[PDB]
Symmetry: C3
Subunit: 335 residues, 3 copies
């Protein structure tokens, strides 16, 4: 039992990376220790300077991804610094009991707490803040991320054959509800508490003002695009703690996808577009076969291109004419 | 054939309970007789006294759950009392032909009819009212429920091993479209017919004013919370006849879930959040491992906490520190 | 390799039909040649004369369905006539690389191009136009359709047993965003370019004005209903390039359904309602057992009956009292 098991300490990393870890392991169960510190801050979320009175685990939207193996215990120290204004907690969907841990992690500014639970189920699971009476506001303002519980012998296909990834990326998709004033301009609030009432009103319309990957329009574009090479297998972890989304890799596929995010279930293959239910994290593997700049996006194209739910993946390597060839380039229609 | 088979008479019960029944059975096929009586009534749907000009099977939202086994015949007498104002009918998604039965059950006030069909497919299926030219209005006003067709040898896991539940609960989730007047207050209508035009306008926005379990905000909370004990397996039947939803048990899981609701298909395990397509009923099993008060809700948290799509499950038993332990309670951050 | 393979030329047909083809085949891989010509035109989309400044492949919403087999190459000549005003391209979700082909098929009016790709994955896949900076507008205005890549040995059930259809129908479901002027009437635009800004504004609300099958309210009703007979198996291909939908056959089922649309995955059986993710095509088989006029629709009933997402299937044959019988017709309630 957990008091007799070896402990290990994991250092988290900022999205869209994921901290180093093993897939299949010869290691036995451990109590894996993590720490997160809550940061409330105002963030610029689009290219015209709109701000969000935001709330984060570890300073980022999403929070960092935590990786353990089935049968490990997650032991998180949750810190709420006195520089914050609101109480916070955490609800791990991967956990069993006490509202996912929320009941045992209620921290006011200047407080901290330590929760342990058993990661007895494999998969990608959302975690998110959930203070009594303020749940949706904390979630939509940025307080969510992914716990990935890998099977002890790695991922498996529907026939039980081994699957793997060579790199992993974590994408959180955030439906935002930014209020507007009488002039039709987005409101800028001096404090987090001042944004509340107006935000609730926008939330109740069910219409996001912005839907962003990793905290801002274009977060995963340009110098910040995801990268890969031909022949590399990428795992794309996609979390949406509040609202449905439908990920698609343009010019690629989901080779093996667990859209409900639970690795004891067989994956589906060859997907064009998959579905992440609001309140869950899903996972797709894809092995790149062509070089070039791919778009990874929500395939409600309005939500992607107008509202912000789209990123890029820049892939190195040799073009393959067997998979795709320009036979005749654009030219005048023969008369 | 059906004319030669034994008949049986089932007495229905009000949601969220489900009438007594066997799971696996040594019984052969029967014609299972049911009766439902339509009631139009005005209902209070939230905590500030908003009303809905409602339409129900048997007086409740949802209608009662009807349970048979694969190969039985359902024989429903549908009664429309003269005290009602509108014609009604029923469309069983579990049935084959004549618009699910709608074409054969058109009853004006003061009329009744009796439909038989063969329940040749296992699963949870929506039934709902569907009068020509008035279909969405009758559905959104409350006229739906679940037919559960159990396999004759009970539920099975993906390996064909037996699954069971110890108790069953039926949850209907209702997207409501309550109109508002020039003062921004919800309108109160003296008759059902007077609510129609204004409701159609709100429906066409696709934005529910309220999204409730079992007919009202808080229906399944307080003295009306669902109950269980540690070690008990609960079946949660979830119907949504009009709009998608994404059920989640906070602090629990879907141990085995048929989110499309069709028991001949293997279930998925370990789900955090599952998806009920508008126009379907799904089913989840969960075995409680921790005591305490769980929330069962739509994980669009705005739809749950702002609009009403959330209930509670109060669970008796002994806490398990292996699954979850508070290691350090909330306390000042060490300086 | 592709340069050494036999070529074949397919003549496309207008939806809701699908061009003649084999299911299981003894044929080896071919380069299958297709041509499509883009047509921009103004279309009447409802029964009160509302117009859409539309954009189509081959003159129809959806574009025609293209059918090949796994291991074939699709070789499409894309023509953009000088009578069109906008540049166009095509993104095949069934293809690997260069944004699905979009990067290699950018055609201005008066130009054409020829793309080849390998159809290495079985399933129904969306194709759609995707010009840089104009993607959602081209999609929502009508520029999408289905590529069906059949397994070389036909469709298979979860046990690997053979499945087939006797006829196939292709349904595209289009979320439209028609602007309105100060009088609350739908705007009519003299050119395609004039509709742009106003349409973007409506798109950003995420609320369709109309949601139609095959380009108009009632497209698949009356003289244009789909047809079948008792004992015939129909394949219903359903594409939605932008927005989720939830198909349902009223009085029927999805006997075998691939709702993600990818034939290497086992289908689900007995579905009441299935789910097509925005940005995908799905496929259902159903064998008719009762005659009569069925409704095939999106089971958000507001989206179906108010906004237009519903069609009819008129089925010939003999009624079966075993599956369904009117026991007592509507009559006065006994006193
Ligand atoms: Cu918080
Ligand atoms: Cu949650
Ligand atoms: Cu009715
Ligand atoms: Cu229905
Ligand atoms: Cu175009
Ligand atoms: Cu696409
Ligand atoms: Zn690799
Ligand atoms: Zn039990
Ligand atoms: Zn046949």
């Amino acid at each position: 039992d957990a008091d007799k098991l070896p402990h290990t300490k994991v250092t988290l990393v900022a999205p869209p990376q994921v901290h180093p870890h093993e897939q299949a392991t010869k290691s036995g169960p451990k109590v894996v220790e993590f720490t997160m510190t809550i940061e409330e801050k105002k963030m610029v979320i689009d290219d015209k300077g709109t701000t969000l009175q935001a709330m984060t685990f570890n300073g980022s939207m999403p929070g960092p991804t935590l990786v353990v193996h089935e049968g490990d215990y997650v032991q998180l120290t949750l810190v709420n610094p006195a520089t914050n204004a609101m109480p916070h907690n955490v609800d791990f969907h991967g956990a069993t009991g006490a509202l996912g841990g929320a009941k045992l992690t209620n921290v006011n500014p200047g407080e901290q707490a330590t929760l342990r639970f058993k990661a007895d189920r494999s998969g990608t699971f959302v975690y998110h803040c959930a203070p009594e009476g303020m749940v949706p506001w904390h979630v939509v303002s940025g307080m969510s991320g992914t716990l990935m519980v890998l099977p002890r012998d790695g991922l498996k296909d529907p026939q039980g054959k081994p699957l793997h990834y060579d790199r992993a990326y974590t994408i959180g998709e955030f439906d935002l509800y930014i209020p507007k004033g009488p002039d039709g301009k987005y409101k800028d609030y001096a404090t987090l508490a001042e944004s509340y009432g107006d935000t609730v009103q926008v939330m109740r319309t069910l219409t996001p003002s912005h839907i962003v990957f990793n905290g801002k329009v274009g977060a995963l574009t340009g110098a910040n695009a995801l990268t890969a090479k031909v022949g590399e297998t990428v795992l794309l972890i996609h979390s949406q703690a509040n609202r449905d989304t439908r990920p698609h890799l343009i010019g690629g596929h989901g080779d093996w996808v667990w859209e409900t995010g639970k690795f004891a279930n067989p994956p589906q293959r060859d997907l064009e577009t998959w579905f992440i239910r609001g309140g869950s994290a899903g996972a797709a593997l894809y092995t790149f076969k062509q070089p070039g700049v791919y778009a990874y996006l929500n395939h409600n194209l309005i939500e992607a291109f107008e509202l912000g739910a789209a990123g890029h993946i820049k892939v190195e390597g040799k073009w393959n004419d067997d998979l795709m060839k320009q036979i005749k380039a654009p030219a005048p229609i023969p008369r």
